[PDB]
């Protein structure tokens, strides 16, 4: 009869849909796991807690002198101590060589800011009291814009910075 | 067979794949 | 009415619904202005002449987020997920408690409204420290949300009275949905409650100098993922147990409906690190675990898509539709109560696709904190949930008040629902596309009109959405007040049964349905899953607190 047959077919095909759904989600998981084994994964923040005092970060330690923010830490590696604050970034510009691994260490003396480097996958929240650590290699020389993409107050829409990647 | 429902989940599948693989491509282009 | 003496829950339900629609209207006033802004048009001067208390774009966005996404949605959930189960069981909720929950919501709303309207809590609906709102914002929001604990109690009470009177019967479907929904929300709600009691309230009151921003956010998003499922599941309750009847059909599977809700109970809460992919100090392995669990929580909506689509198809075939598209044409497109959720569900297709991208850990770095994110969620909550609530004006309000819907009000409702749907689709194109061009969310970008030249095309979409949704909203306001403040009353509308669907004929059930009805057991499982997903990170953060001072940068 009508309803019983419709019911039976509906359920059989639904189970097929669900198995298929699952397969496709599992393939996404495999494709995500691939990203995690590549250099593209550098932009994931370090999970290690690295606490600082937002009230002295402009007076003492590696964020206190932005002209010394860029430090060579290996043969082809540079560490950059970045301050995100209301409403800008220091140093400005950040100047690095292309082809080198750049380790960004970013904190804030005030509120939460974003650090979104347009044209790249660098997109990290910056918490007062915490160091956000992310890694990236700029393959193309030139000027990249930093956008703050976390609401930080009335100056949010004009909070930009600059990275200069030297040939 | 529930042909209408299958068409809906075909559109849903296509949408999901276009979205996901599109952004996957953007992710690697920006890597 | 003697209707209200016999069914006093009708009046309380009405009060939740109207209060929610009022919040919807006020928060939504800001929407068109925000859409124009993402279209690079600054119309805030006009708004501040109309509403002189508005000091900024960001005060507006705070009101928008809080009133639409927190307030309206909760009130709708409290209406639907108390009243539908009560009517299915034909039992009265504890009326003292039901009125307590309304007054708690009302008072909390008023208390939170005061700082918001006075420009003392322009911190957005996420209120991330160390941005520091006025204490009345956090206290009022706290009492508002805690209203729901009374709702949970009320529905567990109804369920237990019913099982006492009916031992050896399985929980009826709508009541099953509501019980697991409210239990899910209990577990879910604990994050924010902890955040408020341990951190935000003592801080806002002066009792501590600082708050640790990472621990605040982690506790926030414990609640912050499942709160969207809390928004969604009332609309699913309608879509599963009422819409099939309005379509002309039947629900095609009771057990598949139960299973979707049970998976929501198990998987809604342990996933919140998918809002913290860009956060320092959370382990990447935990991020990947939460990503995987987030893709699993997609499954119940993948299932819903088929169960619901198949029910609509069945409905359209019953009404004579034949071929692969004829079943669509055959449905009751003349009925706004039918149309509103069906259009919601269409936008849920790109909406859910956007969610799955967001869930995929590394892919989140493409879209995080861009206009993509509001593009996603307007399809989910500002379209499907909202449209389902708007549909309820055309069946639920008459059932609660006896006020009839004229032919003219029905047609107007069709127009509102279509323009709202079309507006949201258009804006979703504008926001997803600007998002992919790196335009930030939560930004007064029309005040930096040369900052995003490449987004010129999507920006046109945003302007157009802005004006379409302003028309939709004005029409919605006119329609709502037309129906409420109507002359006529026909009490037989308030006395009619709710249009609950029948379930299609066919066996297969009983064993799966019995296992799913072990609600105490599944509740314990859900909580265990939360302890495993959150406990290790939270143990670590709590042993390494780093409180920092508060700022007001507005
Ligand atoms: C109601 C409200 C919401 C729902 C539902 C929702 C669903 C998802 N979301 Fe989301 N979302 C995220 C992932 C997901 C995933 C995996 C799902 C899934 O649950 C979705 C599964 C859905 C589907 C698989 C679609 C099934 C399709 C159906 C059921 C329709 C079928 C059509 C029919 C039957 C019609 C047929 C009829 C005919 C006539 C043909 C992530 C990350 O993983 C973020 C953070 C991103 C970031 O960087 O900030 C996020 C951000 C948000 C925010 C912003 C928070 C903030 O303010 O920062 C909100 C408000 C929100 C709401 C909602 N979201 N989301
Ligand atoms: C006329 C209707 C609407 C329009 C035109 C609209 C427009 C917008 C726009 C353009 C934004 C982005 C602002 C930004 O990122 O700076 C936004 C944010 C938002 N909207 Fe809507 N909106 C509408 C209705 C709704 C509804 C009904 C809800 C919920 C049910 C909702 C919830 C939100 C939320 C939660 C945000 C995010 C606030 C935040 O980031 O703090 N909207 N809306
Ligand atoms: C890359 C590929 C992308 C392409 C995506 C297309 C959609 C895929 C699956 C739909 C669900 C499958 C449903 C068919 C299963 C068969 C079934 O269940 O039917 C048995 C039943 O006994 C008969 O009466
Ligand atoms: C019945 C069928 C059963 C079998 C079905 C299997 C599904 C295959 C799908 C995807 C595999 C993922 C491929 C993994 C490699 C991806 C490489 C990649 O994406 O490379 C881009 C980038 O340029 C480099 O860094
Ligand atoms: C109606 C509902 C709203 C609809 C939402 C709009 C977004 C649509 C699809 C996203 C797919 C991704 C788009 C980007 C694809 C670009 C691409 O493939 O990029 C390759 C290249 O390597 C990189 O530069
Ligand atoms: C919807 C329209 C989709 C718009 C496509 C945008 C393509 C894009 O953003 O390109 C990715 C990458 O940043 C380029 O190097
Ligand atoms: C602060 C004071 C709030 C106290 C409010 C006192 C009014 C509560 C009365 C109540 O429960 O309302 C019943 C309903 O409005 C009709 O049946
Ligand atoms: C509706 C919910 C109301 C709850 C509010 C909690 C208010 C805070 C009161 C709890 C005591 C906190 C305290 O005394 O904190 C001292 C701290 O050690 C300083 O160094
Ligand atoms: C009933 C409601 C009672 C709450 C009344 C509590 C009023 C407490 C006021 C405390 C206050 O304003 O302190 C702010 C602080 O100085 C800056 O963070
Ligand atoms: C259901 C539960 C599912 C269980 C799945 C287990 C996930 C395991 C490994 C993720 C490791 C990711 C870490 C790699 C990135 C390292 C990095 O770049 O750190 C900065
Ligand atoms: C960006 C803009 C996107 C616009 C999307 C439209 C979806 C509408 C699809 C739903 C079609 C239903 C119409 C219908 O069948 O109406 C029957 C009526 O009786 C007469 O044929
Ligand atoms: C070329 C594209 C240009 C963009 C259009 C701009 C948006 C809205 C136009 C008006 C649309 C209003 C549609 C109302 C449909 C309606 O009410 O349909 C009822 C019907 O009976 C089935 O339910
Ligand atoms: C249907 C209604 C509108 C179509 C929307 C089409 C959008 C038209 C884009 C025109 C525009 O603003 O382009 C600026 C600039 O020339 C970049 O090429
Ligand atoms: C139909 C679309 C109507 C939208 C009208 C908006 C006009 C607009 O914003 O124009 C942008 C243009 O590309 C630069 O001036
Ligand atoms: C009466 C309502 C009081 C609620 C107290 C316990 C609720 C609970 O956790 O219920 C678990 C589940 O219902 C297993 O019977
Ligand atoms: Cu800094 Cu927004
Ligand atoms: Cl979400
Ligand atoms: Cl969902
Ligand atoms: Cu979420």
């Amino acid at each position: 009869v009508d309803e019983h047959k419709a019911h039976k077919a509906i359920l059989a095909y639904e189970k097929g849909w669900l198995a298929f759904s699952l397969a496709m989600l599992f393939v996404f998981i495999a494709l995500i796991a691939y990203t995690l084994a590549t250099h593209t994964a550098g932009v994931i923040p370090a999970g290690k807690l690295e606490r600082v005092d937002p009230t002295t970060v402009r007076q003492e330690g590696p964020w206190a002198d932005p002209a010394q923010a860029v430090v060579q830490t290996g043969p082809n590696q540079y560490t950059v101590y970045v301050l995100a604050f209301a409403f800008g970034y220091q140093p400005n510009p950040i100047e690095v060589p292309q082809g080198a691994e750049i380790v960004f260490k970013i904190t804030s003396p005030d509120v939460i800011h974003g650090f979104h480097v347009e044209g790249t996958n660098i997109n990290v929240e910056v918490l007062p009291g915490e160091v956000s650590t992310v890694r990236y290699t700029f393959k193309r020389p030139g000027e990249y814009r930093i956008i703050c993409n976390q609401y930080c107050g009335l100056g949010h829409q004009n909070m930009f910075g600059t990275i200069v990647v030297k040939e | 067979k529930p042909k209408g429902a299958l068409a809906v989940i075909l559109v849903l599948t296509l949408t999901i794949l276009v979205f996901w693989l599109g952004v996957y491509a953007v992710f690697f282009a920006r890597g | 009415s003697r209707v209200y003496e016999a069914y006093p829950e009708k009046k309380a339900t009405l009060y939740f619904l109207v209060l929610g629609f009022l919040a919807l209207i006020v928060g939504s006033l800001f929407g068109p202005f925000q859409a124009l802004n993402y279209g690079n048009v600054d119309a805030y001067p006009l708004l501040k002449r109309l509403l002189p208390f508005v000091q900024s774009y960001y005060q507006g966005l705070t009101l928008h987020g809080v009133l639409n996404a927190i307030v309206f949605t909760q009130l709708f959930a409290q209406a639907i997920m108390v009243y539908l189960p009560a009517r299915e069981l034909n039992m009265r909720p504890n009326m003292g408690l039901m009125w307590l929950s309304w007054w708690m919501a009302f008072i909390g709303l008023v208390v939170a409204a005061l700082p918001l309207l006075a420009n003392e809590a322009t911190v957005l609906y996420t209120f991330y420290p160390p941005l520091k709102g006025h204490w009345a914002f956090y206290l009022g929001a706290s009492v508002f949300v805690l209203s729901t604990w009374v709702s949970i109690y009320i529905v567990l009470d109804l369920w237990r009275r019913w099982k006492a009177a009916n031992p050896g019967k399985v929980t009826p479907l709508v009541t099953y949905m509501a019980v697991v929904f409210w239990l899910m929300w209990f577990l879910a709600s604990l994050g924010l409650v902890l955040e408020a009691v341990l951190f935000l309230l003592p801080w806002s009151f002066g009792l501590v100098e600082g708050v640790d921003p990472l621990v605040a956010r982690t506790l926030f998003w414990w609640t912050g993922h499942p709160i969207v499922y809390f928004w969604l599941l009332p609309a699913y309750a309608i879509i599963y147990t009422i819409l099939p009847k309005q379509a002309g059909g039947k629900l095609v599977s009771d057990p598949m409906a139960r299973l979707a809700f049970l998976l929501f109970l198990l998987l809604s809460t342990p996933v919140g690190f998918h809002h913290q992919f860009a956060d320092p100090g959370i382990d990447p392995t935990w991020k990947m675990i939460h990503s995987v669990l987030t893709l699993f929580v997609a499954v119940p909506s993948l299932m819903t898509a088929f169960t619901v689509a198949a029910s609509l198809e069945f409905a359209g075939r019953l009404r004579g539709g034949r071929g692969l598209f004829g079943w669509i044409r055959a449905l009751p497109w003349d009925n706004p109560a039918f149309v509103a959720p069906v259009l919601g569900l269409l936008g849920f297709i790109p909406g859910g696709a956007g969610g799955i991208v967001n869930a995929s850990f590394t892919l989140d770095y493409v879209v995080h904190n861009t206009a993509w994110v509001p593009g996603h969620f307007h399809l989910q909550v500002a379209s499907l949930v909202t449209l389902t609530a708007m549909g309820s004006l055309y069946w639920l309000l008459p059932n609660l008040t006896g006020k009839p819907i004229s032919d003219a009000q029905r047609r107007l409702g069709l127009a509102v629902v279509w323009l709202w749907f079309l507006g949201m689709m258009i804006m979703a194109v504008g926001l997803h596309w600007a998002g992919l061009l790196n335009v930030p969310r939560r930004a007064y970008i029309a005040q930096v009109p040369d900052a995003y030249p490449h987004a010129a095309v999507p920006m046109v979409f945003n302007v157009l959405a802005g004006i379409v949704l302003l028309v939709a909203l004005l029409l919605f306001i006119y329609g709502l007040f037309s129906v409420l403040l109507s002359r006529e009353r026909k009490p037989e509308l308030a006395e009619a049964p709710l249009p609950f669907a029948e379930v299609i004929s066919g066996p297969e059930d009983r064993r799966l349905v019995l296992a799913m009805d072990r609600i105490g057991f599944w509740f314990a499982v859900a909580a265990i899953l939360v302890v495993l997903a959150y406990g290790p990170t939270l143990v670590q953060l709590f042993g390494h607190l780093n409180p920092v001072p508060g700022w007001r940068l507005w």
Side-chain angles (χ1 to χ4, degrees), chain A residues 3 11 14 17 35 51-52 123 125 129 145 149-151 154 156-158, chain C residues 58 122 212 250 278 302 307 362 368-369 442 448 451 505 508 544 546 553:
Chain A
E3 285 200 358
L11 257 57
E14 189 160 14
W17 160 238
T35 66
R51 305 326 206 133
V52 283
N123 195 355
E125 304 262 352
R145 176 161 72 170
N149 63 7
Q150 181 65 263
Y151 162 73
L154 285 179
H156 172 62
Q157 71 288 131
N158 282 284
Chain C
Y58 301 102
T122 302
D212 183 311
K250 294 183 189 189
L302 294 165
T307 301
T362 47
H368 183 64
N369 279 350
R442 301 176 148 192
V448 291
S505 306
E508 136 273 316
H544 298 75
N546 193 19
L553 285 167

Short mmCIF file of all heavy atoms in Angstrom, two decimals, chain A residues 3 11 14 17 35 51-52 123 125 129 145 149-151 154 156-158, chain C residues 58 122 212 250 278 302 307 362 368-369 442 448 451 505 508 544 546 553:
data_model
loop_
_atom_site.label_atom_id
_atom_site.label_comp_id
_atom_site.label_asym_id
_atom_site.label_seq_id
_atom_site.Cartn_x
_atom_site.Cartn_y
_atom_site.Cartn_z
N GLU A 3 1.50 4.29 1.82
CA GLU A 3 2.30 4.89 2.87
C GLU A 3 3.43 3.97 3.31
O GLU A 3 4.54 4.46 3.47
CB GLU A 3 1.44 5.28 4.07
CG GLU A 3 0.61 6.51 3.79
CD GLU A 3 0.07 7.27 5.00
OE1 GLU A 3 0.30 6.85 6.15
OE2 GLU A 3 -0.60 8.30 4.77
N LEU A 11 13.30 5.49 4.00
CA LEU A 11 14.29 5.10 5.00
C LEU A 11 15.52 4.44 4.38
O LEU A 11 16.64 4.69 4.84
CB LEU A 11 13.64 4.20 6.04
CG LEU A 11 13.31 4.88 7.37
CD1 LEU A 11 12.42 6.08 7.20
CD2 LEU A 11 12.64 3.89 8.31
N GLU A 14 17.50 7.28 2.74
CA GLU A 14 18.06 8.12 3.79
C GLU A 14 19.35 7.53 4.37
O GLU A 14 20.30 8.26 4.66
CB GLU A 14 17.01 8.40 4.87
CG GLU A 14 17.48 9.44 5.87
CD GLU A 14 16.41 10.15 6.70
OE1 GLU A 14 15.25 9.70 6.74
OE2 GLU A 14 16.74 11.18 7.31
N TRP A 17 22.11 8.19 2.01
CA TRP A 17 22.50 9.59 2.15
C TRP A 17 23.43 9.80 3.35
O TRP A 17 24.45 10.45 3.23
CB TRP A 17 21.26 10.46 2.26
CG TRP A 17 21.53 11.81 2.87
CD1 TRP A 17 20.96 12.35 3.98
CD2 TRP A 17 22.43 12.80 2.35
NE1 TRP A 17 21.43 13.62 4.18
CE2 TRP A 17 22.34 13.92 3.21
CE3 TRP A 17 23.31 12.83 1.27
CZ2 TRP A 17 23.08 15.07 2.99
CZ3 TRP A 17 24.04 13.96 1.06
CH2 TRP A 17 23.91 15.07 1.89
N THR A 35 46.75 19.33 5.78
CA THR A 35 47.21 20.69 5.99
C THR A 35 48.10 20.74 7.23
O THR A 35 49.13 21.42 7.22
CB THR A 35 46.07 21.73 6.05
OG1 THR A 35 45.26 21.52 7.20
CG2 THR A 35 45.19 21.76 4.83
N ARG A 51 52.88 33.83 29.33
CA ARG A 51 52.21 34.94 29.99
C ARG A 51 53.14 36.14 30.07
O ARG A 51 54.32 35.99 30.27
CB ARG A 51 51.75 34.66 31.42
CG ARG A 51 50.87 33.44 31.65
CD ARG A 51 49.91 33.11 30.54
NE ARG A 51 48.73 32.38 31.02
CZ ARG A 51 47.48 32.69 30.68
NH1 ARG A 51 47.27 33.67 29.82
NH2 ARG A 51 46.46 32.05 31.21
N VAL A 52 52.56 37.35 29.95
CA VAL A 52 53.29 38.59 30.11
C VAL A 52 52.39 39.57 30.85
O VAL A 52 51.22 39.32 31.07
CB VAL A 52 53.76 39.19 28.76
CG1 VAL A 52 54.97 38.47 28.19
CG2 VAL A 52 52.63 39.20 27.74
N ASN A 123 46.19 34.88 10.74
CA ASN A 123 44.93 35.38 11.24
C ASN A 123 44.76 34.89 12.66
O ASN A 123 44.27 33.78 12.90
CB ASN A 123 43.79 34.91 10.36
CG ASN A 123 42.48 35.63 10.56
OD1 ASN A 123 42.32 36.49 11.43
ND2 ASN A 123 41.51 35.25 9.75
N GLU A 125 44.20 35.93 16.96
CA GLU A 125 43.74 36.81 18.03
C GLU A 125 44.92 37.12 18.95
O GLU A 125 45.80 36.27 19.13
CB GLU A 125 42.63 36.19 18.88
CG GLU A 125 41.41 35.75 18.08
CD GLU A 125 40.18 36.65 18.01
OE1 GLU A 125 40.15 37.70 18.75
OE2 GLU A 125 39.21 36.29 17.23
N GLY A 129 48.17 39.94 28.08
CA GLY A 129 48.67 39.01 29.07
C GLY A 129 49.21 37.73 28.46
O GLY A 129 49.76 36.90 29.19
N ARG A 145 49.30 44.37 4.10
CA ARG A 145 48.53 45.09 5.09
C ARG A 145 48.13 44.17 6.24
O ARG A 145 47.64 43.08 6.02
CB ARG A 145 47.30 45.70 4.42
CG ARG A 145 46.38 46.39 5.42
CD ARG A 145 45.44 47.36 4.73
NE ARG A 145 44.44 46.62 3.98
CZ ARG A 145 43.35 47.13 3.41
NH1 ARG A 145 43.12 48.43 3.47
NH2 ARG A 145 42.51 46.35 2.76
N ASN A 149 40.91 42.54 12.96
CA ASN A 149 39.60 41.99 12.67
C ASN A 149 38.84 41.57 13.94
O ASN A 149 37.86 40.82 13.88
CB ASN A 149 39.72 40.89 11.62
CG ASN A 149 40.54 39.68 12.04
OD1 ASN A 149 40.97 39.51 13.18
ND2 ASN A 149 40.75 38.80 11.07
N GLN A 150 39.24 42.12 15.09
CA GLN A 150 38.53 41.96 16.35
C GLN A 150 38.22 43.35 16.92
O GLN A 150 39.08 44.26 17.01
CB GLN A 150 39.32 41.07 17.31
CG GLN A 150 38.63 40.82 18.64
CD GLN A 150 37.35 40.03 18.48
OE1 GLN A 150 36.24 40.58 18.41
NE2 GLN A 150 37.49 38.72 18.38
N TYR A 151 36.93 43.50 17.24
CA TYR A 151 36.42 44.78 17.71
C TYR A 151 37.15 45.14 18.99
O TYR A 151 37.12 44.37 19.97
CB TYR A 151 34.93 44.70 18.01
CG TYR A 151 34.46 45.85 18.89
CD1 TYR A 151 34.35 47.13 18.35
CD2 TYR A 151 34.11 45.67 20.21
CE1 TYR A 151 33.96 48.20 19.12
CE2 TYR A 151 33.68 46.74 20.99
CZ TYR A 151 33.61 48.00 20.44
OH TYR A 151 33.18 49.09 21.11
N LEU A 154 36.31 52.11 19.44
CA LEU A 154 35.81 52.99 18.40
C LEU A 154 36.86 53.20 17.32
O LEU A 154 36.52 53.77 16.29
CB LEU A 154 35.45 54.34 19.02
CG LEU A 154 34.17 54.39 19.83
CD1 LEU A 154 33.98 55.80 20.38
CD2 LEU A 154 32.97 53.99 18.99
N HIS A 156 38.54 50.78 15.85
CA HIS A 156 38.72 49.49 15.20
C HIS A 156 38.87 49.61 13.67
O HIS A 156 39.80 49.05 13.11
CB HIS A 156 37.56 48.57 15.60
CG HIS A 156 37.50 47.27 14.87
ND1 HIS A 156 38.48 46.29 14.90
CD2 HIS A 156 36.47 46.76 14.16
CE1 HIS A 156 38.07 45.26 14.18
NE2 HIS A 156 36.85 45.51 13.73
N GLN A 157 37.96 50.33 13.01
CA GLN A 157 37.92 50.41 11.55
C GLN A 157 39.17 51.05 10.94
O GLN A 157 39.47 50.76 9.79
CB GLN A 157 36.64 51.12 11.07
CG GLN A 157 36.56 52.62 11.32
CD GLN A 157 36.35 52.95 12.78
OE1 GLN A 157 37.04 53.78 13.35
NE2 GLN A 157 35.48 52.20 13.43
N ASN A 158 39.94 51.84 11.68
CA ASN A 158 41.19 52.44 11.18
C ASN A 158 42.44 51.78 11.74
O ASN A 158 43.52 52.32 11.60
CB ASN A 158 41.29 53.91 11.57
CG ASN A 158 40.44 54.78 10.69
OD1 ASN A 158 40.82 55.03 9.55
ND2 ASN A 158 39.28 55.17 11.19
N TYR C 58 29.07 51.06 16.84
CA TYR C 58 29.32 49.91 17.71
C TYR C 58 28.29 49.77 18.83
O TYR C 58 27.96 48.65 19.22
CB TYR C 58 30.76 49.99 18.21
CG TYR C 58 31.77 50.01 17.06
CD1 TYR C 58 32.38 51.18 16.64
CD2 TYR C 58 32.07 48.84 16.38
CE1 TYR C 58 33.27 51.19 15.57
CE2 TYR C 58 32.97 48.83 15.32
CZ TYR C 58 33.57 50.00 14.92
OH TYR C 58 34.42 49.92 13.83
N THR C 122 29.14 49.14 25.40
CA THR C 122 29.34 48.96 23.97
C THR C 122 30.47 47.96 23.77
O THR C 122 31.53 48.32 23.29
CB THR C 122 29.57 50.32 23.30
OG1 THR C 122 28.40 51.06 23.63
CG2 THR C 122 29.78 50.22 21.80
N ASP C 212 41.23 37.15 33.33
CA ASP C 212 42.03 36.45 32.34
C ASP C 212 41.22 36.31 31.06
O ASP C 212 40.19 35.62 31.06
CB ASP C 212 42.47 35.10 32.90
CG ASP C 212 43.37 34.34 31.95
OD1 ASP C 212 43.01 34.23 30.72
OD2 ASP C 212 44.41 33.83 32.44
N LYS C 250 2.77 14.36 6.14
CA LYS C 250 3.01 13.73 7.43
C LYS C 250 4.51 13.67 7.69
O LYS C 250 5.31 13.64 6.75
CB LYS C 250 2.51 12.29 7.43
CG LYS C 250 1.01 12.12 7.30
CD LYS C 250 0.55 10.68 7.38
CE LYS C 250 -0.93 10.55 7.03
NZ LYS C 250 -1.42 9.19 7.32
N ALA C 278 41.89 30.57 16.20
CA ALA C 278 42.87 31.64 16.13
C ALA C 278 43.33 32.11 17.51
O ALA C 278 43.98 33.17 17.60
CB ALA C 278 42.28 32.77 15.31
N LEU C 302 22.35 17.19 8.58
CA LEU C 302 22.36 16.43 7.33
C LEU C 302 21.20 15.44 7.32
O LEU C 302 20.48 15.29 6.34
CB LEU C 302 23.72 15.75 7.15
CG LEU C 302 24.90 16.71 6.96
CD1 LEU C 302 26.22 16.00 7.14
CD2 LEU C 302 24.85 17.37 5.61
N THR C 307 15.13 14.01 6.11
CA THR C 307 13.86 13.67 6.73
C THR C 307 12.81 14.71 6.35
O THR C 307 11.68 14.39 5.97
CB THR C 307 14.01 13.53 8.25
OG1 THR C 307 14.97 12.52 8.55
CG2 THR C 307 12.70 13.22 8.93
N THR C 362 42.09 24.63 9.86
CA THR C 362 42.97 25.48 9.09
C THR C 362 42.18 26.34 8.10
O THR C 362 42.60 27.44 7.80
CB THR C 362 44.04 24.66 8.35
OG1 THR C 362 43.42 23.56 7.70
CG2 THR C 362 45.15 24.18 9.27
N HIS C 368 38.14 33.63 9.29
CA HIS C 368 37.96 34.04 10.66
C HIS C 368 37.94 35.56 10.79
O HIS C 368 38.86 36.23 10.38
CB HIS C 368 39.04 33.50 11.61
CG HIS C 368 38.82 33.85 13.07
ND1 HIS C 368 37.74 33.41 13.80
CD2 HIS C 368 39.50 34.62 13.90
CE1 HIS C 368 37.80 33.89 15.02
NE2 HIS C 368 38.85 34.65 15.11
N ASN C 369 36.89 36.07 11.44
CA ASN C 369 36.72 37.46 11.80
C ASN C 369 36.56 38.33 10.56
O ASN C 369 36.72 39.55 10.66
CB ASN C 369 37.81 37.94 12.74
CG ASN C 369 37.62 37.57 14.20
OD1 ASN C 369 36.57 37.09 14.64
ND2 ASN C 369 38.63 37.86 14.98
N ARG C 442 32.50 43.40 12.14
CA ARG C 442 32.39 44.26 13.32
C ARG C 442 33.14 45.59 13.10
O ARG C 442 33.78 46.09 14.02
CB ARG C 442 32.94 43.56 14.57
CG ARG C 442 32.27 42.25 14.96
CD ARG C 442 32.89 41.53 16.15
NE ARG C 442 31.85 40.80 16.87
CZ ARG C 442 31.95 40.24 18.08
NH1 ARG C 442 33.13 40.08 18.66
NH2 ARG C 442 30.84 39.94 18.74
N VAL C 448 35.96 54.39 6.48
CA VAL C 448 37.23 54.30 5.77
C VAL C 448 36.92 53.86 4.35
O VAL C 448 37.31 52.77 3.92
CB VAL C 448 38.24 53.35 6.45
CG1 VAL C 448 38.73 53.91 7.77
CG2 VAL C 448 37.65 51.96 6.66
N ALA C 451 39.33 51.98 1.97
CA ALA C 451 40.16 50.92 2.55
C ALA C 451 39.98 49.60 1.79
O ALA C 451 40.91 48.80 1.75
CB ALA C 451 39.89 50.79 4.03
N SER C 505 2.66 5.83 8.13
CA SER C 505 2.54 4.42 8.48
C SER C 505 3.79 3.65 8.05
O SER C 505 4.42 4.01 7.06
CB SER C 505 1.32 3.78 7.84
OG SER C 505 0.15 4.51 8.13
N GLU C 508 9.36 -0.58 12.19
CA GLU C 508 10.83 -0.54 12.18
C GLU C 508 11.35 0.05 13.50
O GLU C 508 12.55 0.03 13.79
CB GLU C 508 11.37 0.14 10.90
CG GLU C 508 12.51 1.15 11.07
CD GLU C 508 12.09 2.59 11.37
OE1 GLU C 508 11.15 3.09 10.72
OE2 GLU C 508 12.73 3.24 12.21
N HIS C 544 46.94 28.60 35.68
CA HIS C 544 47.89 29.55 35.13
C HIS C 544 47.18 30.84 34.75
O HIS C 544 47.52 31.47 33.77
CB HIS C 544 48.62 28.93 33.93
CG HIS C 544 49.43 27.72 34.28
ND1 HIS C 544 48.88 26.48 34.53
CD2 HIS C 544 50.77 27.57 34.40
CE1 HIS C 544 49.85 25.62 34.80
NE2 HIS C 544 51.01 26.26 34.72
N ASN C 546 46.08 34.67 34.44
CA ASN C 546 46.80 35.91 34.21
C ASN C 546 45.79 37.03 34.02
O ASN C 546 45.48 37.43 32.90
CB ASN C 546 47.77 35.83 33.03
CG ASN C 546 48.71 37.02 33.02
OD1 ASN C 546 48.87 37.68 34.06
ND2 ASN C 546 49.34 37.30 31.89
N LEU C 553 36.96 51.58 25.65
CA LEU C 553 37.51 52.35 24.53
C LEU C 553 36.37 52.79 23.61
O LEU C 553 36.34 52.50 22.43
CB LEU C 553 38.57 51.49 23.83
CG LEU C 553 39.89 51.36 24.58
CD1 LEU C 553 40.76 50.26 23.99
CD2 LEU C 553 40.63 52.67 24.52
#
